[PDB]
Every structure is written in C-alpha cells, then in structure tokens.
C-alpha cells in the first residue's frame with residue numbers, strides 16, 4: 001500500500017461525505033500521496049500549487065486565504081480528508097453549497113458577517129494574484145470599486161456587513177456569479 005491505499009472504513013467515510021465514487025476517492029488519494037508524501041500539505045506547498053497556476057502575479061495572499069478554508073481543523077496542515085471534502089464542494093457542489101463555502105472564505109474571522117474590509121482583503125488578493133498582465137475596465141479596475149459594487153448589490157440593510165442570507169441572495173441575483181458557481185468538474 002505504502003499508504004497509497006486508504007483503510008476501507010476511511011474510503012467508505014470519504015465516499016459518503018463527497019460527490020466522489022470510491023474509485024475517484026482512491027485515485028485522488030494516490031495523487032495526493034505522490035505530490036505530498038507525508039500526507040499533510042503545508043501553507044508553503046499550497047502556495048506552490050497556486051504559484052504554477054498563476055505565475056504572473058503574487059498569489060501568496062489569496063492562496064493563504066484558501067488554504068485556511070481547506071484547513072477545517074486549523075492545525076496548519078491540509079490532510080487528505082480536508083483536501084477531498086474541499087475539492088468535492090468547490091468542484092461538484094450545488095450552488096447553495098458552493099455559496100456557503102464561498103462565504104466561509106470571505107468571512108475571515110468566522111463571525112457570521114462579511115464586512116467591507118474582509119471583502120476588500122480577499123478582493124485585493126485576487127487582483128494581486130492575476131496581476132496587471134491585462135488592463136481591466138475602468139469601473140472595476142481597483143479592488144475598492146469591485147467591493148463597492150458588491151455591497152451596493154447585496155447589502156440590503158446598508159450596515160456595511162453581509163449576512164449569509166444577503167450574500168446568498170445577492171449572489172443569486174447576479175448572472176455572472178450564478179454562472180461561476182454552477183460548474184461541475186469545471187463545466
């Protein structure tokens with residue numbers, strides 16, 4: 001096995017917690033192990049993954065935000081159970097499940113609201129990750145302008161924070177958000 005096989009009860013458990021079949025779970029564990037022999041992905045390794053996908057801007061900050069959502073137990077490592085569950089929601093979830101995950105990504109302090117400064121932190125990290133290989137349209141060319149449009153559309157009581165309900169409904173109102181979150185294996 002060389003631990004490239006999971007225990008049977010662990011295969012059954014992870015298949016039951018994800019949109020993957022038993023075979024798919026086993027294939028992902030095999031790749032996870034070749035790429036991370038210790039069975040634990042650290043923040044540095046996560047940033048390397050994002051560094052290859054996005055070699056034009058600095059993805060340090062954004063990969064760290066994502067790393068922290070993958071890291072459901074906050075021990076500073078991604079283990080396979082965490083990895084596979086995060087991949088299942090982000091690649092195969094329903095729109096409501098992806099929106100719940102997205103909310104956890106933006107709710108940096110886990111208090112149930114996304115403030116404007118929280119969203120600005122995430123959106124700045126995204127802008128930095130893409131980097132200015134291309135010029136954006138003027139009305140969305142800073143992270144501030146993007147956050148202001150989002151709060152205009154979604155902050156219904158205009159208190160400077162988004163509840164989970166405001167983010168979900170606000171997200172569903174915008175066709176480009178709906179589109180981005182309704183993919184299954186990217187399609």
Ligand SMILES: O=C(Cc1c[nH]c2ccccc12)N/N=C/c1ccc([N+](=O)[O-])c(O)c1
Nearest residue numbers: 031032035049066070083086087090091105
């Ligand atoms: O290791 C991975 C996944 C993954 C895909 N293909 C692989 C091959 C080898 C190892 C890992 C992978 N990080 N992406 C994570 C992720 C997190 C959040 C979002 N979001 O922000 O939407 C997303 O789209 C993907």
Ligand SMILES: [Ca+2]
Nearest residue numbers: 071075077078
């Ligand atoms: Ca962990």
Ligand SMILES: [Ca+2]
Nearest residue numbers: 107109111113
């Ligand atoms: Ca918060």
Ligand SMILES: [Ca+2]
Nearest residue numbers: 155159161162
């Ligand atoms: Ca609000």
Ligand code: NA
Nearest residue numbers: 015018019020
């Ligand atoms: Na499954």
